[PDB]
């Protein structure tokens, strides 16, 4: 028998840990999201994944569309873009951590993920 | 040299005394091989009529 609410968030992906010995979450799976969207309950599938799993609040160089570029001054702590020296372009975007983890992994190969902020 | 064996794992297993019918069945088990657990064709799972009196028809794991 298992019930998990919140608990060990895996550090690499910011997701519930699993197992039953710790709080232990229940993998949702690729087979189940399909049924949840068949019903057309997009918001239930949004709430569950984003809010009960990795919902992060990252910053983007809106002009240059790079997750990696925004920077914090050593202690005001106003974000400034490293690639282009503009500090007022930076704005926040809701995104997962595995999305950030994937941008990092893709950079680990010289590939660039340029994202269009709106 | 693999000892003329063809298998390099599952050679020894834990004998668990959950019951005396779990224990007594570890000394009468015969494993066709651990590699055959990964096979598309199922022909080493056929219960041929030549194992009459040597292997039990009913006593086989069921998964």
């Amino acid at each position: 028998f298992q019930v998990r609410t919140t608990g060990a968030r895996d550090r690499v992906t910011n997701q519930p840990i699993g197992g039953r010995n710790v709080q232990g979450g229940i993998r949702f799976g690729e087979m189940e999201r399909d049924a949840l969207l068949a019903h057309g309950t997009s918001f239930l599938l949004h709430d569950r994944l984003f809010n009960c799993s990795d919902r992060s609040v990252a910053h983007v160089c809106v002009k240059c569309g790079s997750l990696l570029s925004p920077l914090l001054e050593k202690p005001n702590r106003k974000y400034n873009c490293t690639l282009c020296s503009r500090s007022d372009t930076i704005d926040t975007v809701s995104v997962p951590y595995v999305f950030r983890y994937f941008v990092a992994e893709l950079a680990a190969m010289n590939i660039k993920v340029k994202l269009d902020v709106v | 040299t693999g000892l003329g064996l063809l298998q390099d794992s599952g050679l020894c297993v834990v004998a668990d005394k959950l019951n005396f019918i779990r224990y007594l069945s570890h000394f009468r088990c015969v494993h066709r091989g651990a590699d055959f657990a990964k096979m598309r064709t199922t022909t080493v799972r056929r219960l041929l009529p030549e194992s009459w009196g040597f292997l039990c028809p009913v006593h086989t794991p069921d998964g």
């Binding site: 019930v3 840990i17 690729e30 068949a38 599938l45 569950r48 809701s94 990092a104 | -």
Partner: protein, 1477 residues
């Protein structure tokens, strides 16, 4: 306060390598990353500028701790350049086809410029420009070609701009994919150089990390880099389009990027406490960098030194490779998995942590039967309820009940674990002092209000899931009925079949929505009463099971009488009514003693459940229990009685009062059109759930109070005097082996008793093994005759107790549980065991089991079990039964393993297809798949009662249907004129043209003067220009000798008006229905106005109110916009397969059709009807005998080879036994040897010897004219008496038993055969309606080689299972229907029946872009979504592609929408809300 900013698009490109700098906090140089004690060593991989890896530290780059710091990137600076492993292969090609001297590609500039212009036009979307440019080229120096093409290309790109946003669509990505793939595949091969003839400096790459130019030097990444740098300069205009402004520098790496330390977490491995696999690969690169930096200094302080430099280079590349793809380099060890393995697999990062995240606020526990909670409820065991918390905001109208919850505390049930503050957060109440919780019960309502995380409160909504989720009904929402003292989640038994739950240890998950906007959807959409009908075929899913079926069938039987007090307390115990009086009935029997009927109990329970305002329903149908089950005693002839007019087989509910019928599974069950299905149609899904609940409670009270159900041994027993016949039949069955086998080997009818054993042994040790299966089949036949005789003797009437009073019957016979084949096989026979469709296999000595003699004829030795489970089965039969039962489980496992993959592939391709607001089924990029969902709209579950034969129900219940749903309001707010006039026009047209295939035309209509012309006018001419002498007179009279504008033969010959759904928008246009529905409505109105005339019941409905009723019920069953029907089609094709004779069957065929789309199928076939004429029937015999293949080997007795002078005599067979059905003659056969076999023989002799170290006369002469080895053959003036040949190779040849060659060749040598056809056969009868049909089936496929017999066979009605051959002879719109029919016939062999609206969508998607495209990994290449297409399979190839093409993603798929955290673009997310100011 969320970021508020959303994503529109994600593009994948390559980083400059100069902008990665400034994306780097510091360069790392220290190899040893783990400190002596386990902390980060400065300047190592784990550093404090690359971020705090753990909460203990703070980053040096930005002061901030873990969980708040976005990590930073660093770089191992490499000693010298290395090639990048992903852009490497392309580099190789960019160097294979090129002149290292000239620095220009070896391709003809025509191809270069053509492809350049095609890419320039594709970038804007213009798709006809592609072929237009290619044809402009072919129809046409280098400047000359460029100016010819660039004018047209610039004109296109200018006149067709504004289309850069409308270019990311399928059919524009497939074209670019194909163009660039063809370029890389056909024009980059090594070639002699154009300008200098000797410019092939052949780059030829060994294993990765090795490129070798010849004069065998080793290509140093610096020399290759300079070559690319100087080749870009000359050929850049062209490559900047083949790669996006790619710089050649990106093809090479001067540093490696170390990812942030938060994404590299130290775990443990054997004998190492702190290690990440990614840091162990990067550490190997750092260590080689250090050794190489030493050798360079050694050269500076200065063949072995530079051979060592070239070896350490190759080693540093094979490490930088491993860092990118663990298995790019196979010769290195200590190789942990690279990034290709971090991303691309089932473990992976997309199929886990991307599509399958782990969720909070969820429970999982064993489920238990409840039955005393309503069908829409789940029982929560007070241990989840006290932990699962919903975070509700505090407002003036809830602050009272929230205050009690904060006072009750974290551990009492209506309580709360925490309260979140307006600006702060998370002040937990979990203390148990009970005073601070009161100190905080105030200050509620004392910006965003405090939110109380309350517990589950007995009305909440929960999503419940069972893990093999194969359909939409496997996730449904339930209403949180809290139960005290348990750890199990209790669920009603009506919801079992939906989940497939079985209460044998059946863990199930329960999710708790936390948004108040997912609760609205769990209530409205995912609710468990909107899920009454399965989406596969619209048939009901919820229903009562087991003893609610044997209870209701024994109470509703005719002889069940109840006193007032058992009548009551049986009504109130089913109702448990809470609102209003229970309306009762009158006794059926009023006099000797007032008594009720049991059908009256169900009646009075039915008139209380139906909503007060609505009126009870009328219903007429059939029961599951046949009216023959009750016939005890022989039926006698009553002269005027139709026994079925008054039978317990016909269910007749008249105004909610059951008047006749048993009401078994056919109602209350999962069968369609029953009482609960009609309740769900007329009164909604909540009323059907109420009916199910109340009927379950009633049928439980009945068995628990006054009756009882059991299953003893006196209902499986069999009468004596009936087991004597069974025993005599079993004795007779022990003598049917010899005859069976013998008459299957076509042996002498008798006199052979040992030749038969030898023939069986030969057939068993044979190679083909198809004369053995013949015996197996013709043997499971005498045995089957005795079983039929045995089941009939005992099962119907040989049982000790009969059906009304038997407990096994009345359980299999009312649909409760089991089957007549379970009932038998428990009594009077177990049957014939069959393992692979064949009898049990024999040993290697010819015995099936150690107890049986070898080759024993008795059926007992072949698995014919005559024992029953009543009196057990003997040891040998036990063995065969175990073999069968075990193969069953093995097959289950393997079948599920294959079905899962099939369904995953299907669901991954058809997922983005949703119905739009213009009723058209479009994909994610807007590509129109269908212009109307089912070809008419009309989602499946709502079209169940729109079938005919269900109108007499809608007519009977008309008043309830109009009041409950449409109402008088909609009927009179309908205006049908536009659609009604269209159907009148269609009807008039079809009235003037009965035969709609008669070649209508204006001029054709002006051939009625045909006699006028043929009489005298045209009698004098010849075929002037090939037409005729008499056709020219008609042409002259028609052409200009007719009226100017009043020559209107046109109107008499004009097209049928186009269908109404096509022009008149079925949703907003009343009376615009399908052409097949209006025909049904006309037929029924005509057959219903002629029933009212002789009805003795007053009907207050008129044909023209019934018509409006049906038209409204159609217009309302119209597939709401946003339905996402492709996912439903995927799941409907998947679930039936996952669960569940010369052709293929099962998942093999489904995978051939859908996933592979092969041109080679295992069993191709054809079926042309035979034309039904006396001449055709006679010609067909010859046709069948004409297309079968006759092979040299099928006509031969034995060869006689003598041996360097190798003679050969063929000795052919006599015509007695092969000319009968092969249509051959000896001169043709022998002539074949002279011209084909006797030269293929020398062909094979050379095949071996190349790598070894009056009239007889003309025939012989021409034959040796052509070959120099033969000498002279023979002649056979009398039926091929002796026909040998002689050869000789006199010098030195390998004299062996060459008979091997001349026998391996005399098998694949076929006299003559139609290409592709292996055999024909005329299956005499294929129809009962018009039994006269004949079919010429075939086992090969050649469509054109049948076109010559358009008079012997019907070439319309020709069918084949190939779907690639049909698509090549008849087109793609004809292959669509073959695909649909193939899927339907595959599902039909198992009784499954998927709705045609799903196969229509699947076939329309597969054949979308003109070709039969497979639904698999190669079908996604023509897909406009890089984020999809990489969440499926080969994620790294699809990422490399999307990266070297700059491919842009629009975030419109479900996968791309769930990857970047958006709301899917179908179902509930398809529109905005736009609060007005």
């Amino acid at each position: 306060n969320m970021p508020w900013r959303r994503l529109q698009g994600i593009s994948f490109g390559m980083y400059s390598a100069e902008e990665l700098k400034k994306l780097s906090v510091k360069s790392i140089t220290n190899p040893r990353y783990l400190d002596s004690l386990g902390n980060p060593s400065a300047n190592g991989l784990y550093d404090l500028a690359l971020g705090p890896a753990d909460s203990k530290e703070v980053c040096s780059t930005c002061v901030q701790d873990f969980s708040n710091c976005s990590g930073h990137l660093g770089h191992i600076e490499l000693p010298l350049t290395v090639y990048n492993p992903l852009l490497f292969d392309k580099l190789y090609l960019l160097l294979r086809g090129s002149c290292l001297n000239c620095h220009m590609l070896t391709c003809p500039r025509a191809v270069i410029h053509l492809l350049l212009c095609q890419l320039r036009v594709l970038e804007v979307g213009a798709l006809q420009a592609v072929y237009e440019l290619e044809r402009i080229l072919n129809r046409f120096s280098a400047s000359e070609i460029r100016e010819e093409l660039e004018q047209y290309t610039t004109e296109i790109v200018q006149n067709n701009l504004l289309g850069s946003q409308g270019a990311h669509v399928k059919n524009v990505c497939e074209s670019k994919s194909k163009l660039i793939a063809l370029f890389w595949k056909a024009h980059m091969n090594a070639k002699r150089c154009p300008h200098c003839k000797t410019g092939r400096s052949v780059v030829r790459k060994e294993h990765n990390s090795k490129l070798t130019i010849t004069f065998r030097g080793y290509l140093t990444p610096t020399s290759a880099r300079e070559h690319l740098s100087a080749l870009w300069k000359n050929e850049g205009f062209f490559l900047n389009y083949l790669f996006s402004r790619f710089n050649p520098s990106v093809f090479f790496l001067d540093f490696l990027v170390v990812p942030p330390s938060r994404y590299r977490p130290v775990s443990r491995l054997g004998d190492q406490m702190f290690t990440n696999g990614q840091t162990v690969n990067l550490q190997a690169v750092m260590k080689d960098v250090v050794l190489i930096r030493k050798l360079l200094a050694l050269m500076a302080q200065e063949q072995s030194l530079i051979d060592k430099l070239y070896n350490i280079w190759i080693r540093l590349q094979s490490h930088v490779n491993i860092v990118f793809d663990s298995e790019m380099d196979k010769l290195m060890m200590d190789k942990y998995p690279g990034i290709r393995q971090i991303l691309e697999k089932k473990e992976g990062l997309f199929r886990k942590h991307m599509m399958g995240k782990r969720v909070d606020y969820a429970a999982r526990s064993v489920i238990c039967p409840d039955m005393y909670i309503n069908t829409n409820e789940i029982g929560i065991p007070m241990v989840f309820a006290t932990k699962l918390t919903y975070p509700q905001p505090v407002t003036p109208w809830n602050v009272q009940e929230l205050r009690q919850a904060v006072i009750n505390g974290p551990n009492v049930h209506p309580g709360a674990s925490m309260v979140i503050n307006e600006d702060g957060s998370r002040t937990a109440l979990s203390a148990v002092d009970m005073t601070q919780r009161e100190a905080v019960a105030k200050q509620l309502l004392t910006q965003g209000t405090k939110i109380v995380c309350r517990h589950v409160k007995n009305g909440d909504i929960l999503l419940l899931n069972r893990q093999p989720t194969l359909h939409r009904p496997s996730i449904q929402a339930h209403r949180a009925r809290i139960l005290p003292e348990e750890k199990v989640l209790r669920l009603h038994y009506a919801n079992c079949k939906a989940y497939n739950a079985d209460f044998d240890g059946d863990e199930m998950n329960a999710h708790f929505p936390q948004s108040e906007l997912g609760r609205a959807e769990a209530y409205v959409l995912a609710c468990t009463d909107q899920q009454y009908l399965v989406p596969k075929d619209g048939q009901p899913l919820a229903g009562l099971i087991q003893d609610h079926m044997v209870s209701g069938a024994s109470m509703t039987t005719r002889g069940c009488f109840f006193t007032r007090e058992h009548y009551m307390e049986l009504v109130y115990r089913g109702l448990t009514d809470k609102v209003g009086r229970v309306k009762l009935l009158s006794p059926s029997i009023l006099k000797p003693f007032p008594l009720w009927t049991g059908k009256q109990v169900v009646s009075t329970l039915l008139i209380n459940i139906i909503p007060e305002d609505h009126i009870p329903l009328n219903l007429s149908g059939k029961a599951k229990i046949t009216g023959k089950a009750w016939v005890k005693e022989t039926p006698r002839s009553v002269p005027g009685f139709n026994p079925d007019s008054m039978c317990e087989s016909q269910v007749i509910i008249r105004e909610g009062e059951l008047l006749c019928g048993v009401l078994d599974k056919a109602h209350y069950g999962s069968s369609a059109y029953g009482l609960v299905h009609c309740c769900y149609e007329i009164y909604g899904g909540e009323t059907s759930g109420k009916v199910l609940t109340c009927l379950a409670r009633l049928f439980t009270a009945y068995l628990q109070l006054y009756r009882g159900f059991t299953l003893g041994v006196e209902d499986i027993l069999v009468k004596p005097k009936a087991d004597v016949k069974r025993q005599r039949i079993i004795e007779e069955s022990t003598h049917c082996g010899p005859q069976a086998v013998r008459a299957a080997l076509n042996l002498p009818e008798a006199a052979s008793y040992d030749e038969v054993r030898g023939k069986w042994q030969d057939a068993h040790l044979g190679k083909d093994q198809r004369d053995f299966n013949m015996i197996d089949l013709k043997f499971k036949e005498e045995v089957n005759h005795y079983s039929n005789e045995i089941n009939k003797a005992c099962m119907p009437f040989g049982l000790h107790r009969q059906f009304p009073e038997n407990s096994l019957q009345m359980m299999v016979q009312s649909g409760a549980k089991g089957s007549t084949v379970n009932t038998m096989q428990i009594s009077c026979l177990l049957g014939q065991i069959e393992l692979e469709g064949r009898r049990p296999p024999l040993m290697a000595s010819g015995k099936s089991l150690p107890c049986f003699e070898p080759y024993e004829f008795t059926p007992r030795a072949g698995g014919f079990v005559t024992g029953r489970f009543l009196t057990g089965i003997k040891p040998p039969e036990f063995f065969f039964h175990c073999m069968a039962g075990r193969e069953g489980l093995v097959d289950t496992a393997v079948k599920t393993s294959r079905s899962g993959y099939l369904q995953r592939c299907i669901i991954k391709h058809l997922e983005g297809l949703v119905v739009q607001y213009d009723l058209t089924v479009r994909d994610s990029d807007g590509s129109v798949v269908q212009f109307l969902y089912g070809e008419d709209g009309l989602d499946i579950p709502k079209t169940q009662f729109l079938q005919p034969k269900q109108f007499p129900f809608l007519a009977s219940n008309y008043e309830v249907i109009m009041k409950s749903q449409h109402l008088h309001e909609v009927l009179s707010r309908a205006d049908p004129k536009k659609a009604l006039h269209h159907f009148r026009a269609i009807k008039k047209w079809q009235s003037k043209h009965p035969n709609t295939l008669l070649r209508r035309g204006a001029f054709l209509s002006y051939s009625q003067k045909i006699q006028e012309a043929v009489k005298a006018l045209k009698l004098e001419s010849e075929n002037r220009n090939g037409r005729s002498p008499g056709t020219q007179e008609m042409l002259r009279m028609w052409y200009e000798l007719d009226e100017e504008s009043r020559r209107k033969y046109q109107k008499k010959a004009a097209a049928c008006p186009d269908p109404s759904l096509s022009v008149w928008r079925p949703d907003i246009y009343f009376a615009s229905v399908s052409e097949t529905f209006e025909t049904k409505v006309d037929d029924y109105s005509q057959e219903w106005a002629a029933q009212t005339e002789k009805s003795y019941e007053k009907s207050e409905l008129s044909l023209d109110r019934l018509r409006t009723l049906l038209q409204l019920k159609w217009q309302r069953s119209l597939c709401e916009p946003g339905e996402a029907v492709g996912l439903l089609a995927a799941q409907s094709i998947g679930e039936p397969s996952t669960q569940m004779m010369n052709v293929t069957l099962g998942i093999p065929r489904l995978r051939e059709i859908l996933m592979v789309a092969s041109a080679n199928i295992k069993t191709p076939m054809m079926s042309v009807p035979v034309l039904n004429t006396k001449k055709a029937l006679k010609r067909v015999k010859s046709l069948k005998k004409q297309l079968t293949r006759v092979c040299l080997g099928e006509v031969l007795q034995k060869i006689d080879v003598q041996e360097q002078v190798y003679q050969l005599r063929f000795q052919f067979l006599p015509h007695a036994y092969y000319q009968q059905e092969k249509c051959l003659r000896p001169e043709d056969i022998l002539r074949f040897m002279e011209t084909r076999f006797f030269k293929l023989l020398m062909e094979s002799i050379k095949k071996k010897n190349n790598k070894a170290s009056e009239a007889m006369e003309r025939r012989v002469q021409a034959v040796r004219e052509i070959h120099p080895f033969i000498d002279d053959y023979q002649y056979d003036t009398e039926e091929s008496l002796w026909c040998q040949v002689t050869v000789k190779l006199p010098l030195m040849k390998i004299n062996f038993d060459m008979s091997s060659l001349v026998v391996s060749l005399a098998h694949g040598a076929v006299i003559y055969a139609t290409k592709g056809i292996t055999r024909c056969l005329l299956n005499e009868t294929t129809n009962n309606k018009n039994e006269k049909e004949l079919v010429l089936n075939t086992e090969g496929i050649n469509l054109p080689e049948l076109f010559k017999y358009a008079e012997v066979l019907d070439l319309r009605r020709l069918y084949s299972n190939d779907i690639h051959a049909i698509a090549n002879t008849y087109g793609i719109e004809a292959a669509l229907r073959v695909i649909e029919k193939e899927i339907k016939d595959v599902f039909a062999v198992y009784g499954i029946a998927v709705d045609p609206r799903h196969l229509s969508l699947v076939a329309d998607y597969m054949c979308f872009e003109g070709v039969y495209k497979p639904l698999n990994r190669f079908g996604i290449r023509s897909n406009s979504s890089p984020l999809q297409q990489m969440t499926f399979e080969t994620s790294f190839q699809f990422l490399k592609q999307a990266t070297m093409l700059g491919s842009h993603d629009e975030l419109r798929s479900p996968s791309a929408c769930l990857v970047v955290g958006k709301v899917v673009r179908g179902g509930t997310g398809l529109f905005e809300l736009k609060q007005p100011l």
